[PDB]
Design a protein around this nucleic acid. Structure first.
Ligand SMILES: *[C@@H]1O[C@H](CO)[C@@H](O[C@@H]2O[C@H](CO)[C@@H](O)[C@H](O)[C@H]2NC(C)=O)[C@H](O)[C@H]1NC(C)=O
Ligand code: NAG
Ligand code: NAG
Ligand code: NAG
Ligand code: NAG
Ligand code: NAG
Ligand code: NAG
Ligand code: NAG
Ligand code: NAG
Length: 750
DNA sequence: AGGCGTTTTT
DNA sequence: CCGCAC
């Protein structure tokens, strides 16, 4: 039986997904199909320029409708094609259940009439240039109104969006209003007193006063950032904040005593007025980024009163054309007792010392501290020792060079207690002295440095708690036998993209150190170009995962018996990646010399044209085999052998022409099978024995299927349509004639 | 005539 | 195969 909503896809929680099917108008569906069960209808990015009274009438319990991007204005059109969208008056009224509507990135100039059931309405990036009380008649349940970007550089209108005084007061439930990028020069008068979130960013409201926010006592979040911009920091087109602006009256925010978040970023602020923050005793988030407060953060008392503040963003508060020799934070910072998160990135200051952060040192909740992109070239890292609650320091993209004068394969540092990011700095060696006071560290990132050192066991001596060490994108020379043995708790070590030593033709390298790292569980040697003159064996009793991708086992395994047992000493290894190893061939003895313990083997993006499938019994525990991106011409040369434990098999992006009968039949555990992007002209139940109904996933997309009248595959795919992702739209015909490139369901074949 | 195309936010 | 110790 067919999929119930062609050409669209049924999904969980009653979602019918019609996205990206290039529809010229709204599909009505079959009258047999259960239009009652439909709670959400997605039509993202089709080309429906005309909506009608009948289009949603049969959908009697529709709660959500997304029609975004269907008829975008000239300015947001990839090729500046104009487009104006027509809506018959009862289009939406005929859906009295509708709660959420999205008409963004569509060419409409008036708001259509809408059912009183509506809770959320998104009109962003339209050409609606006015809102008067008649726009939103009888929407007494409406809580959300987003209408950003109806007049800006990418969707211009020649004037300002005019919202009439009092025009929204009819919306007594309204909590969220956003009117960004609308070329506004003043806040709309008399907005709903129910408002909790008022977002007015990237307009040109250069003046504010308490009259501009009258009766808005319910406000929890106000955003007025980007109204008076510093264009020296802009990535997009930008008009410079005029001379002697902006003007924010002292008491502007005083009646807003529920206010949790205030955003004043990119407002060209040279000085903070402590009266701006009087009365804001619920204030937990303050964004002051992209201002000119480099000098004001050394002196100001403006923070004194902010007992509840948790996140303070002071980033990109830099002085034009300069970095500072020194920076000393104001003593007032020391009263921010609730502070958890401080962003100081992009201020530009050359020295990080005891004096720089002294106020912050006894704040008991301070966990996250962002210090990146500051052109810092001296940094006493010992300053962080006695910070009571520190979990994360980002010191990346700085100029520090020393001490002062898939998580299957590589775990992240998120669940760990203390992480220092020193990546994208100028270290050429590692002096143990710079980490003397950081013995509590559990994760250290040192990637993208210039480390050209022959490490030997004496570089990281103090880091007695360190579990993860990322040294990717460096030039470590792996040669001495006791490198890293000084890190007693080391569990994960990333040595990827440290290729330059291994490119040194005629100079060999020694990986015997790996055997001396007794708790190492994860090791990456990826993208190192490892090809000749290296250790014959990797030995480790403890290792679980090894990313050996982007090397040339090809050249190693071509070189007599020298490297045939290369991975065999990894006695506990469960995951191995041998992808992009230029492998044109594999011996069955080479695969048998892999650890018996293996569960995941990747061989993606190699050049294998042949695979002796029987040799999979030499890996008893193998659950996942990835051969994507090879050149298999067929699934043949035996079948998947008896008793294999294989659950996942990916033979996508090969040149597979056919599959032998009974090929998967003996793979009793096989759940996911990817046959995508091959040259398969059919799909057959004969391939599976008669056990295809146990497959949870069967991807057969981008295959040049032969769409002939009464073809066997059509009936088959409907048998197991549960498991075929994208069946309604992305499984396509390669022949005959007219049908090439069109869906299998573009015409009924049965 | 309409087409374009997976488009975050700035 | 990179200051070892013919
Ligand atoms: C089956 O494999 C295909 C192709 O190898 C997957 O589709 C690709 O997905 C990746 C990321 O998931 C993208 O970078 C590619 O652009 C996609 N390519 C194509 C041609 O679609 C597909 O997602 C896999 N199937 C399953 C069920 O995971
Ligand atoms: C903003 O409004 C002014 C007129 O008040 C106009 O000159 C300018 O072009 C408008 N901006 C846009 C993007 O239309
Ligand atoms: C808000 O919506 C409710 C129903 O959810 C309705 O009682 C009323 O019209 C609105 N209430 C207020 C106080 O505005
Ligand atoms: C604030 O609310 C009252 C009505 O409750 C009204 O009289 C007053 O004009 C409002 N103020 C402004 C500035 O709109
Ligand atoms: C915080 O919020 C409540 C109302 O939501 C307000 O009445 C109270 O005065 C505020 N101030 C402080 C210091 O918590
Ligand atoms: C490592 O080489 C250094 C030179 O930086 C040398 O002083 C030291 O004795 C060697 N350390 C170990 C642990 O072998
Ligand atoms: C590699 O290092 C180990 C440990 O020092 C050593 O015993 C082995 O002989 C070295 N390999 C070569 C080729 O010298
Ligand atoms: C493998 O199968 C292909 C056909 O798919 C055939 O051409 C080839 O000779 C076979 N070789 C072996 C060794 O089974
Ligand atoms: C696979 O390898 C085994 C053992 O070397 C051999 O007996 C068998 O004939 C091979 N199969 C093919 C199709 O080459």
């Amino acid at each position: 039986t067919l999929p119930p909503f062609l050409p669209c896809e049924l999904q969980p929680h009653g979602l019918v997904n019609c996205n990206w099917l290039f529809l010229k108008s709204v599909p009505h569906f079959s009258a047999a199909a259960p239009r009652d069960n439909v709670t959400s209808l997605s039509l993202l990015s089709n080309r429906i320029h005309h909506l009608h009274d009948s289009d949603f009438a049969q959908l009697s319990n529709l709660q959500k409708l997304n029609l975004k991007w269907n008829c975008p204005p000239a300015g947001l059109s990839p090729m500046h094609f104009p487009c104006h969208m027509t809506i018959e008056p009862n289009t939406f009224l005929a859906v009295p259940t509708l709660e959420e509507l999205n008409l963004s990135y569509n060419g409409i100039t008036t708001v259509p009439a809408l059912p009183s059931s509506l809770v959320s309405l998104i009109l962003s990036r339209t050409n609606i240039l006015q809102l008067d009380p008649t726009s939103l008649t009888g929407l007494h349940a409406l809580r959300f109104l987003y209408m950003d970007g109806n007049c800006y550089y990418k969707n211009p209108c020649g004037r300002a969006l005019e919202v009439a005084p009092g025009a929204l007061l009819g919306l007594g439930n309204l909590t969220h209003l956003s009117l960004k990028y609308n070329n506004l020069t003043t806040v709309p008068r008399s907005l709903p007193p129910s408002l909790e979130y008022l977002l007015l960013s990237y307009n040109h409201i250069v003046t504010l006063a308490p009259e501009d926010l009258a009766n808005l006592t319910a406000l929890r979040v106000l955003d007025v950032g980007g109204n008076c911009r510093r264009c020296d920091h802009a990535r997009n087109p930008c008009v410079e904040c005029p001379h002697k602006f902006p003007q924010l009256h002292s008491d502007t925010f005083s009646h807003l005593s529920r206010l949790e978040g205030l955003v004043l970023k990119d407002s060209s602020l040279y000085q903070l007025n402590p009266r701006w923050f009087r009365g804001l005793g619920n204030l937990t988030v303050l964004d002051l980024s992209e201002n000119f407060l480099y000098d004001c953060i050394t002196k100001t008392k403006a923070f004194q009163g902010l007992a509840q503040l948790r996140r303070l963003n002071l980033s990109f508060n830099y002085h034009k054309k300069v970095s500072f020799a020194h920076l000393t934070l104001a003593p007032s910072f020391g009263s921010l007792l609730s502070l958890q998160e401080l962003d100081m990135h992009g201020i530009f200051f050359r020295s990080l010392s005891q004096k720089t952060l002294q106020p912050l040192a006894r704040l008991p909740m301070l966990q996250r501290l962002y210090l990146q992109m500051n052109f810092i070239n001296q940094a006493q890292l010992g300053i962080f020792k006695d910070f009571p609650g520190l979990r994360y320091i980002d010191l990346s993209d700085n100029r520090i060079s020393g001490a002062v004068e898939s998580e299957d394969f590589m775990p992240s540092c998120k669940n760990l207690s203390f992480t220092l990011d020193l990546s994208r700095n100028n270290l050429v060696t590692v002096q143990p002295e710079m980490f003397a006071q950081l013995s509590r560290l559990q994760c250290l990132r040192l990637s993208h440095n210039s480390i050209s050192q022959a490490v030997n066991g004496s570089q990281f001596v103090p880091l007695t708690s360190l579990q993860v060490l990322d040294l990717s994108h460096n030039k470590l020379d792996l040669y001495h036998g006791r490198s890293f043995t000084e890190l007693p708790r080391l569990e994960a070590l990333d040595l990827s993209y440290n290729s330059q030593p291994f490119s040194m033709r005629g100079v060999g390298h020694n990986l015997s150190f790996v055997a001396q790292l007794p708790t190492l569980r994860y090791l990456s040697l990826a993208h190192n170009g490892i090809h000749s003159r290296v250790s014959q064996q990797l030995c480790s009793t403890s290792l679980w995962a090894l990313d050996f991708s982007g090397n040339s086992l090809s050249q190693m395994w071509a070189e007599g018996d020298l490297y045939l047992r290369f991975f065999q000493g990894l006695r506990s290894l469960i995951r191995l990646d041998l992808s992009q190893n230029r492998l044109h061939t594999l011996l069955p003895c080479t695969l048998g010399n892999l650890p018996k313990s293996l569960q995941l083997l990747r061989l993606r993006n190699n050049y294998l044209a042949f695979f002796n499938w029987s040799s999979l019994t030499l890996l008893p525990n193998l659950e996942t085999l990835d051969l994507a991106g090879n050149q298999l011409k067929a699934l043949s040369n035996g079948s998947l052998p008896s008793g294999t434990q294989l659950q996942r098999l990916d033979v996508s992006r090969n040149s597979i022409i056919f599959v032998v009968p009974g090929f998967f039949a003996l793979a009793t555990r096989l759940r996911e099978l990817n046959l995508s992007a091959n040259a398969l002209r059919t799909v057959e139940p004969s391939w599976f024995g008669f056990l295809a109904g146990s497959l949870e996933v069967l991807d057969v997309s981008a295959n040049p299927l032969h769409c002939a009248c009464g073809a066997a595959f059509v009936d088959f795919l409907l048998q197991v349509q549960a498991a075929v992702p994208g069946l309604p739209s992305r499984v396509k015909c390669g022949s005959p004639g007219q049908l090439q490139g069109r869906s299998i369901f573009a015409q009924d074949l049965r």
